[PDB]
Design a binder for this molecule. Structure first.
Ligand code: MAN
Ligand code: MAN
Ligand code: MAN
Length: 36
């Protein structure tokens, strides 16, 4: 997964695309999707 307040998705992101089992994939901005 990715950590809390980490990146699950982005325009130019290159890491885990799954949020933590305590966090969820959500959008903060069209260039940064956060794990909440
Ligand atoms: O997926 C999230 O939890 C994992 C541990 O269960 C971590 O390895 C990962 O990087 C995320 O924090
Ligand atoms: O989840 C934590 O580690 C991640 C990298 O493995 C980061 O993307 C995240 O922001 C946290 O620091
Ligand atoms: O995720 C991939 O692109 C990123 C920059 O947009 C790099 O920082 C990363 O290491 C990967 O190459």
């Amino acid at each position: 997964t990715q950590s809390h307040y980490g990146q699950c998705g982005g325009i130019g992101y290159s890491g885990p695309t799954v949020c933590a089992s305590g966090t969820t994939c959500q959008v903060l901005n069209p260039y940064y999707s956060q794990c909440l």
